[PDB]
Design a protein around this ligand. Structure first.
Ligand SMILES: *[C@@H]1O[C@H](CO)[C@@H](O[C@@H]2O[C@H](CO)[C@@H](O[C@@H]3O[C@H](CO)[C@@H](O)[C@H](O)[C@@H]3O)[C@H](O)[C@H]2NC(C)=O)[C@H](O)[C@H]1NC(C)=O
Ligand SMILES: *[C@@H]1O[C@H](CO)[C@@H](O[C@@H]2O[C@H](CO)[C@@H](O[C@@H]3O[C@H](CO)[C@@H](O)[C@H](O)[C@@H]3O)[C@H](O)[C@H]2NC(C)=O)[C@H](O)[C@H]1NC(C)=O
Ligand SMILES: *[C@@H]1O[C@H](CO)[C@@H](O)[C@H](O)[C@H]1NC(C)=O
Ligand SMILES: *[C@@H]1O[C@H](CO)[C@@H](O)[C@H](O)[C@H]1NC(C)=O
Lengths: 904, 904
C-alpha cells in the first residue's frame, strides 16, 4: 500500500527543509529507490511518442535506422543520467526538485540557465501532450465530433488543424483549471496514470507474442502496389455482389464516377491492376521483418507503395483514396520527432526531498529507469518491424486499417486498450507538465537569480504558483497554435537537449578545472562520459534544426551571462567592476584547493622599492629591471614601507601609492602596489615580504636593491637592515634577487648591441641561477647578448646540461677548477644543508673569487652570482657584508641570487 | 613613379623593426594611405569570383536577391573593417602584417586563433585561385588541350574534373616553385596584376555603357523556350541551305539521327517548336532587367528555359545540346560561392610597416577600399541584370554564347580582354596567397604561441619560410583535389568568416569588459558595430554550411584554449594551476583601471583573529559570524598576528596558518588566510589592516573581537591595543565591526526560532547599520528573526525609509525622542564631521543610553549599535573604553559598528 506521486518539488519543499533545520512528519514520506526514482522516472519517460509515432517511425525509417535513432537518443539520455548522478552524489542533495540539486552543484548561473531551458521544455511538453490527447481523441476515438467538418480534399487537412487548435485550446484551459484547483488529485492519480502506461506496454508485448501463432485479422485493401484507405470501403473487391447480382463495389465509386458500371469510365490504374486483401499483421514468424528493414523517406503527398505485390505501370489516376505520406520525412526529422520520448530523466530527481538515501537511490534509480525505457523502445522497434506490414507502419493516422491505432492492432485484448491507455497517459503527462513547469518557474523566481521573473515568485496560500502558471499556459497556447505533434516535437526536443547539454558541460568543466566542492562520489563517473554525452546531443540539437539550436544556445548564453552579471552586482555592488571581482575571487579560490608546488618554478617578483625622505622612489631601476625580468607577464607586487605612524601619514601613503603606480606604468610594469606605513622600516619590510599577495597569488622571489654607501653612512641600520631582509627571505623560503649598482641597469628604451650575461653557477641553487638569464634574454633589451656559465663546482651537472639543452637557447658552460678553501663559505653552507636534510679565511678566499671572476667576466653586461647564506650569529653581519662587497668589487652590474627554496 | 607591393609583412619585418629599436632606409618605403592601404586592399578584394561567377550569380539569383547577397557580404566585411580599424588606431601599430596588429591588440590567444583561421583561409584561397586560373585556361582559352578527352555525355563532366585535378596540381607545383624562387618578382609585378584587374573592370563598365546604343552581336540559338548550346552549331536554323539546296542543319543532326532528312525521325520537341536567334546582349535600354529580376534556382540537370519565347508543350526529347544547370543552386549556396570576393580586408593592413601614419591610413584606406569594391559589385549586379539575357547569365561555363566568358561579352574591345585579364589576375592572386599563407604561418610559429608549429618557424637565408610553404602547398593540394570553385568557395569563405567573427568578437568583448590598454581612438567605432558584424557573419557562416561552421568554431576554440594553456604553462610554470593564476591576475588588472568606488557598498571582511600563546584561535566565533555575515559569497580575508621574531617562528607561522585554514573550512568560511609574524601585536595588526588583499581585492571592513576582561588584566596593553586598531581602521577609512560577547554568537549548525535584530540607528553612518541585518537575515541562522530599528535621531530619514522599502524585507522603525545631552558624544562627533566637510558627562549620558537601550532591547538576539569615534587625545582612551563598556552593559550580543567611510 502506497500513495506516491511523480511530480516535482519546488520552493515549497526546499523552504520546508530549510525551516526544519531547527522528524516524524518527514519520516513517513521517505521512499525507497524503486518507488522514489525508478517509477517517477519511468512514468515520465514513457510519453505519447512511443504510441502515436513509434510505429510510424519504425515504418518510415526501417528497423535498422529506427534502431539507430532510438540508440542515439538513449545514449544522450544515458550519458546525461551518468552526469546527473555525478551531480546527485556530490554534496548534500537539497530537498527541492532536480533544479535545486543542479543549482547547488553547478552554481546559480548554470542553475538558472538549465532551469529556464528545462522549463521551456516542460511547457512545450504540456503543449505536445495536449496535442497528442486531442489527436488521439479526435482521430481515433471520436472522429465524427469536430469543430470543422472535412471540406473538399485540399482543405480537409487544414480543417483538421483548425479542429486541433480549437480543441487543444479548450483542453489546455481545462488542464490549467485542473492544476490550479485540485493538484492533490493529480498527485493521487499519478499512480493510475503509470498503471495505464504499463498496462498499455504489456498489452503491446502480449500482442506481439500472440502474433506468433495467432495474429489478428486486420487486412488492408491494396490496389496493386498502391495502398488504399479503408475508412469508407467495405470489401477489398472490385465488385461487391448484392442480392445475387455482381454490382460494383464502393471502391468502384471512388475510382469511377458511374457507380453503376453502365459503360463505366474507370481510370487507368484501376482498370489495369487488382485490389487485394493483404494481411496487415502477419505472424511474428511470418518473416516480414526482412521486408521492412529499409528506409522509405517518401516526400510529402507521395502514395505509399508496398514493394512486394504485383503492379501495372500506367500512371496518372490520382485519387483521394490513395493513402499519402503526410509529412516530408527524413532522418533528421525522425530523430526530432522521437526525442521527446526519452526526455524526463530529470524527473528521476524530482522527488529528492522524500528519499532515504538520495546519493544512492538517484543514480541507480535513474540509470535503471533509462535502461528499462531504452529496452522497451529498442525492443518495440524490432517488434513493430517484425509484426506489422511495411505499409501499415507508414500510415501516420491509422488509415488503411479501418481507422485504428497502428500499434493498437498489436495488443492482446483489442486496440481499444491501447487507444484509451494512450489518451489517459497523454492527458496525465499534460497535467504533470503543467504542474512541473510552474513549480520550476516559481523556484527560479524565488531564488532571485533573475530579477524580472520576480513577478512569478508569487504563490498561492498553499505555495502553488498563481502567476507562473498563467505564463506557462500562455506559452503552451503558443505551442498548441502549431497544432501538430510533428512540429512541436522538434522545439520541445531542442529545449530539453539544451538542458541536457548544459548539465553535461557543467560537469565536464567542473571536473577538469578542479572546481571547489566538486567531489563526484560515483563509482563510474568520468568526465569523458559527460563530455561524450554533451557532444552526442549537441550533435543531436544541431541535426534536428541548425537554426533552432543556435537560437536555444544564444538564449541560454544570454540567460547565463545575465545571471552572472546580476550575481556580481548583488554581491560586490557593481556590475562590471563586480564581475571582474568575482572572476578574480573564483580563480583564487579554485587556486587554493590544489597542490601547493608547481612542476616548474617561475619567479613571481616582490620588488622592494625604497622610499626616501621625500617619498620618492630611490631606485626606479628596480622597476625597470623587474619589467625586463618578467617581460610584462606574470605577477609583480611592488611593495614599499613609509617610516612613520599610520594615524597621520594616510595622505602621504595615498600620494606615494599614486607615485609608485605612475612609475610602474612608466616602466611598463604590469602589477600591483602595496604600501605599509610602519614604525620601523625593517619590520615593515619583514611584514611585506611575508604578507604580500592574496593566498595562492603569493610571490616567491624578493627583489631588493643593494644598500649602496653602507660604510660611508655613520648609521649602521642601513647595512644591518639589508641583512635582516636577507634572513627574512631565506627563512620564508623565498628566492632572493639582490641587485647591485642598480643605477647602471639598462632602461626599457635602450638596448645592448653585444654582451655576455655571465651566470656564475656555484655548488648549489643552480635552478634559479640558470633560469634567470633566459628570462632576461627573452626581453628586447637583453636580447642581443650571449650567456656564459662559469661553473666552479656530477649528476647535478649532467642534469643541468640536459636542462640547458631543453631550454634550446645557446649557452656555453666553462668549468674552472678552484681550491676548496677558496670556496669554503659555499662548501660550508652546502655541508650545513646536507647535514640538515673564519672571517679572515672568508675574506682571503673572497679575494681569490674576485681574481677569477674579474679575470673572466670583468667586461660582462650582467654578472649573476650565487650567494652564501647569512651568518648564524648576527654579530658577523659586518663581516658578511664585507665579504659580499669584496666578492662583488669591480663588476659593473651584479645580480646576487639566493635560491633558498625547492626551485626546479 | 613607384615600386610598391600588395603582399604581407611577416616575421622578417617585425624583427627588423624590433632590432631597429636602437632611419634613412625606412623612410624611403614610407607610403601614403592611398598606395599603402587603398590599393593593396583593392587589389586583394577583387578576386576571380567577380568574373567567373558574378554573372552566374546574378542570373541564377535575380537582381534583387543578388543585390541582397552582395549587400550582406559587404556588410559583414564593412563592420569587420570598422572593428579592424578600431584595432589599428589602438596603441602603436607593429611593423608586421595584420596578424601582428591583431595579436598585440587582442592578446596572443585571439592572435593565434585568428592567425590560423585566416591562414587556412589564405591556403584554400590559393587553391580556389589556382582552380580558377585552370578553369579559365581550360574552358575558355584552350578547350582543345585537356588531359582527359570527353567521356560519353554524362561522364564528360567527370573528365573535366580530372582535367582540373591534374592541371591544377601541375599549376600549384609551378606556383610553389615561383614563390620559392623569386618572390621579388611577385612584388615587382603586383602592380601589373592590379593593372589587369582595373583594366578588366573598366572594360566591363565600358561594355555596359556601349551596350546602350550599340550592343554586341552575341546571339543565342534557342529552341522554343529551351536554350541550346552553340559550341558545335553554326546556324540557328533548322535547315542550313547549302549550294542552293535546303540541306538540314547540324542541329537537325543533334536532334534527329538521320542527318539527311530522308524521312527523318525527329523527336517531339524538335518537330513542334522553332529554333530562334535571341539577341544575347540586348541594349542597356532594352529593358530586360524587368525580365531577369527574379530567382531561378533550378536544380541539377534541369534545362535552362527563357520564360519569354513561345513553346509547345510536348516533352520527353532529352538531348545533349540542352544547356543544363550544372549545380543545384540555392540562396545559401550562392552566398557561399560569392563570399570569397569580399575577403581580403586584412590585406589593407598587410603593409603596415611601410606606412607614415598607420592609425590614420589604415582605417580610412580600408573602409574606402571596401566601399569601392562594394560599389563595383553592387553596380555590376545591376548592370548584368540589365544588359545580359536572363538565360546567358545562368550559363556557368559560357555555353550558348559560342563558348565565351559571360561577362566577357560585356566589354568595349572584346571578351578577350576580360578572359585574359581574369586569368592573369587569378594566377596573380594565387601567387599572392602562396606568399601570404606561409609568411603568416612562420609568424605564428616564430611567436612560439603554439609549440608544435615550431618546425615551421624555420626560415630561408633571407627569412622566407622553407617548411611553412610546403605545408601550405599540401593543404592547397588537398583543396585542388576538390576541383570545383563552387565547392572550394564555401570552405574558404568559412575560414575567412571565422577570422572575421573572431576579429569582431574580440573587439566587442574588450570594449565591454574594459580590458586594459583597449583605447580605440576612432571617431566612429562603437562596440555595437563590431557586435553587429559578428552577428551578421556568424549568421553567414551558419547559413553557408551548418556543419562546416561548427567544425571551424571547434577548431578555433581548441586552438584558442590550447594557446591559453601554453601561455599559462609558459609564464606561471604549471598548466591548470597557472591557468587559474592567469585568470586571477587578469581579473585583478582589469579591476584596477576602473572607478575606485562602487555604486553600492557591500562589506568585504577582514576578520582579525587573535592567536593565544598556544597559537590557537582565541575566538572561532569570529569566523562563524563572518561566515554568517558574508553567507559564503564575497571576500573574507582572515588575518592574524603571531607575536615574536619571524626569523625563528616560520614553522609556527606555517602551523598556525594550517590551523586557521582548517578552522575556516570547518566554519564554512570561503576566503584566504594571511599571517604576519610581528615584533609588536599592535603594529602587526596595523599592518594587516592596511595591507591585506591584492590591489582591487581590498577589504573595506575590519571585523574585530572585543577585548574581554580588559579591566581584570593588569596589563593595559590589551585594552589600549583595541583602541589603537579602532583608530587605524577609522584613519584608513574602512568600516569597523566590533563584536562583543562573541563567545555567545550562534554557531553555523544551530538556529534561532524567533528573535529581533535590534539595529540602533543613531545620527549618522546609517548605511552600514541598515545594510548589516539584512545580510545577516539572508543566512539560515538569522533567517527566522525580525528586525527593529530604534532610531534616536529628516531628509536622510526619508531616504532611509525609501532604501528600506527597496530592500523589500520587513522591518519596523521606531523613533525614540532623546535629549541632546544624552547623545552629546554623537552630536559632538557629527558636528566635527560637518565642520570638517566632558568624561563625566559622557558617562552620565551613556547610562541614559543604557536605560533606553535595555528597556527596549534587553531580550534581543543581536543588538547592532553605532559607535562614537575614539578621542583625539590618546589620554582619554580609558574613558572611551569605559564609555563603550557601560553603553553595552547588559546586552547579550552586541555588534558595535562604525562606518567611517563613504558607505552607500
Ligand atoms: C509500384 O508500382 C509502380 C508502377 O509501376 C512503380 O512505378 C515504377 O516503378 C519502377 C520500378 O520498377 C520505377 O523505375 C523504373 O525502373 C525500370 C527498370 O528497368 C526502368 O526501366 C524505368 O525507366 C524506371 O527507371 C519507375 O520510375 C516507377 N514509375 C513509373 C512511372 O514507371 C513503383 O516503383 C512501384 N513501387 C515500388 C516501391 O517499387
Ligand atoms: C518552357 O516551355 C515548357 C513547355 O510547355 C513549359 O513546360 C510546362 O509549363 C507549364 C507552364 O505554362 C507548367 O505548368 C502548367 O501550367 C498549366 C497552366 O494552366 C497547367 O494547366 C498545367 O497543369 C501545369 O501546371 C508545366 O508544369 C510545364 N511542364 C509540362 C510538362 O507541361 C515550361 O514551364 C516553360 N518554361 C517556363 C519558365 O515557363
Ligand atoms: C490481376 O488479376 C488477374 C486474375 O486474378 C491476373 O491474371 C492478373 O495478372 C492480375 N494483375 C496483376 C498486375 O497482378
Ligand atoms: C513556329 O514557327 C511557325 C512559322 O514561323 C509559327 O506559325 C508557329 O506558331 C511557331 N511555333 C511556335 C511554338 O512559336
Amino acid at each position: 500500500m502506497a500513495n506516491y506521486t511523480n511530480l516535482t518539488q519546488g520552493a515549497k519543499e526546499h523552504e520546508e527543509a530549510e525551516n526544519i533545520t531547527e522528524k516524524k512528519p518527514t519520516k513517513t514520506p521517505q521512499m525507497g529507490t524503486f518507488m522514489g526514482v525508478y517509477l517517477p522516472c519511468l512514468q515520465n519517460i514513457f510519453g505519447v511518442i512511443l504510441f502515436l509515432r513509434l510505429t510510424w517511425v519504425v515504418g518510415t525509417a526501417g528497423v535498422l535506422q529506427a534502431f539507430a535513432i532510438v540508440l542515439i537518443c538513449c545514449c544522450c539520455t544515458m550519458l546525461t543520467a551518468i552526469s546527473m548522478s555525478a551531480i546527485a552524489t556530490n554534496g548534500v542533495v537539497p530537498a527541492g526538485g532536480s533544479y535545486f540539486m543542479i543549482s547547488r552543484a553547478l552554481g546559480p548561473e548554470f542553475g538558472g540557465a538549465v532551469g529556464l531551458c528545462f522549463y521551456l521544455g516542460t511547457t512545450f511538453a504540456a503543449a505536445m501532450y495536449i496535442l497528442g490527447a486531442i489527436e488521439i481523441f479526435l482521430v481515433y476515438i471520436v472522429p465524427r465530433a469536430a469543430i470543422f467538418h472535412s471540406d473538399d480534399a485540399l482543405k480537409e487537412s487544414a480543417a483538421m488543424l483548425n479542429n486541433m487548435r480549437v480543441y487543444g485550446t479548450a483542453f489546455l484551459v481545462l488542464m490549467v483549471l485542473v492544476v490550479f484547483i485540485g493538484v492533490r488529485y493529480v498527485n493521487k492519480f499519478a499512480s493510475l496514470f503509470l498503471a495505464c502506461v504499463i498496462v498499455s506496454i504489456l498489452a503491446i508485448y502480449a500482442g506481439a507474442i500472440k502474433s506468433s501463432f495467432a495474429p489478428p485479422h486486420f487486412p488492408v485493401c491494396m490496389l496493386g502496389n498502391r495502398t488504399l484507405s479503408s475508412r469508407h470501403i467495405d470489401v477489398c473487391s472490385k465488385t461487391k455482389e448484392i442480392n445475387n447480382m455482381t454490382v460494383p463495389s464502393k471502391l468502384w465509386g471512388f475510382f469511377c464516377n458511374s457507380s453503376q458500371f453502365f459503360n463505366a469510365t474507370c481510370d487507368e490504374y484501376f482498370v489495369h491492376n487488382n485490389v487485394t486483401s493483404i494481411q496487415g499483421i502477419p505472424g511474428l514468424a511470418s518473416g516480414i521483418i526482412t521486408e521492412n528493414l529499409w528506409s522509405n523517406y517518401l516526400p510529402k503527398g507521395e502514395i505509399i507503395e508496398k514493394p512486394s505485390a504485383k503492379s501495372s505501370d500506367v500512371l496518372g489516376s490520382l485519387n483521394h483514396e490513395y493513402v499519402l505520406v503526410d509529412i516530408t520525412t527524413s532522418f533528421t526529422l525522425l530523430v526530432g520527432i522521437f526525442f521527446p520520448s526519452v526526455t524526463g530523466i530529470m524527473a528521476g530527481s524530482n522527488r529528492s526531498g522524500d528519499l532515504k538515501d538520495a546519493q544512492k537511490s538517484i543514480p541507480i534509480g535513474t540509470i535503471l529507469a533509462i535502461l528499462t525505457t531504452s529496452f522497451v523502445y529498442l525492443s518495440n522497434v524490432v517488434l513493430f518491424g517484425a509484426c506489422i506490414e511495411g505499409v501499415v507502419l507508414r500510415d501516420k493516422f491509422g488509415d488503411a486499417v479501418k481507422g485504428n491505432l497502428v500499434v493498437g492492432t498489436l495488443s492482446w485484448p483489442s486496440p481499444w486498450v491501447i487507444v484509451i491507455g494512450s489518451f489517459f497517459s497523454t492527458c496525465g503527462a499534460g497535467l504533470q507538465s503543467l504542474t512541473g513547469a510552474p513549480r520550476l518557474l516559481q523556484a527560479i523566481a524565488k531564488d532571485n537569480i533573475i530579477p524580472f521573473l520576480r513577478v512569478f515568485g508569487h504563490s498561492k496560500a498553499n505555495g502553488e504558483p498563481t502567476w507562473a502558471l498563467l505564463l506557462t499556459a500562455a506559452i503552451a497556447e503558443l505551442g498548441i497554435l502549431i497544432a501538430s505533434l510533428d512540429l512541436v516535437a522538434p522545439i520541445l526536443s531542442m529545449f530539453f537537449l539544451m538542458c541536457y547539454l548544459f548539465v553535461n558541460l557543467a560537469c565536464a568543466l567542473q571536473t577538469l578545472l578542479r572546481t571547489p566542492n566538486w567531489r563526484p562520489r560515483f563509482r563510474y563517473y568520468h568526465w569523458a562520459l559527460s563530455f561524450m554525452g554533451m557532444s552526442i546531443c549537441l550533435a543531436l540539437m544541431f541535426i534536428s534544426s541548425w537554426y533552432y539550436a543556435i537560437v536555444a544556445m544564444v538564449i541560454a548564453g544570454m540567460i547565463y551571462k545575465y545571471i552572472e552579471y546580476q550575481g556580481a552586482e548583488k554581491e560586490w555592488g557593481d556590475g562590471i567592476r563586480g564581475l571582474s571581482l568575482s572572476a578574480a575571487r573564483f580563480a583564487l579560490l579554485r587556486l587554493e584547493e590544489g597542490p601547493p608546488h608547481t612542476k616548474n618554478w617561475r619567479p613571481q617578483l616582490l620588488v622592494l622599492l625604497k622610499l626616501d625622505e621625500d617619498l620618492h622612489v630611490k631606485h626606479p631601476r628596480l622597476l625597470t629591471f623587474a619589467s625586463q625580468l618578467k617581460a610584462g607577464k606574470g605577477l609583480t607586487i611592488v611593495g614599499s614601507v613609509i617610516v612613520g605612524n599610520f594615524l597621520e601619514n594616510y595622505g602621504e601613503a595615498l600620494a606615494a601609492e599614486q607615485t609608485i603606480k605612475h612609475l610602474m606604468e612608466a616602466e611598463k610594469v604590469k602589477g600591483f602596489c602595496q604600501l605599509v606605513v610602519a614604525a620601523k622600516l625593517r619590520e615593515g619590510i619583514s611584514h611585506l615580504i611575508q604578507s604580500c599577495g592574496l593566498g595562492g597569488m603569493k610571490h616567491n622571489t624578493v627583489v631588493m636593491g643593494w644598500p649602496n654607501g653602507w660604510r660611508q653612512s655613520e648609521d649602521a641600520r642601513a647595512w644591518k637592515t639589508f641583512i635582516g631582509t636577507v634572513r627574512v627571505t631565506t627563512a620564508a623560503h623565498l628566492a632572493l634577487l639582490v641587485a647591485k649598482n642598480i643605477s647602471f641597469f639598462p632602461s626599457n628604451v635602450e638596448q645592448f648591441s653585444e654582451g655576455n650575461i655571465d651566470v656564475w653557477w656555484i655548488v648549489h641553487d643552480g635552478g634559479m641561477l640558470m633560469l634567470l638569464p633566459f628570462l632576461l634574454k627573452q626581453h628586447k633589451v637583453w636580447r642581443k647578448c650571449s650567456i656564459r656559465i662559469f661553473t666552479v663546482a656530477i649528476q647535478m651537472k649532467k642534469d643541468l646540461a640536459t636542462f640547458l639543452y631543453h631550454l634550446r637557447i645557446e649557452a656555453e658552460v666553462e668549468v674552472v677548477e678552484m681550491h676548496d678553501s677558496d670556496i669554503s663559505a659555499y662548501t660550508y653552507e652546502r655541508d650545513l644543508m646536507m647535514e640538515q636534510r673564519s672571517n679572515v679565511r672568508r675574506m682571503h678566499t673572497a679575494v681569490k673569487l674576485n681574481e677569477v671572476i674579474v679575470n673572466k667576466s670583468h667586461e660582462a653586461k650582467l654578472v649573476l652570482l650565487n650567494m652564501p647564506g647569512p651568518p648564524r650569529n648576527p654579530e658577523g653581519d659586518e663581516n658578511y657584508m664585507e665579504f659580499l662587497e669584496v666578492l662583488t668589487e669591480g663588476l659593473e652590474r651584479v645580480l646576487l641570487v639566493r635560491g633558498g627554496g625547492s626551485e626546479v
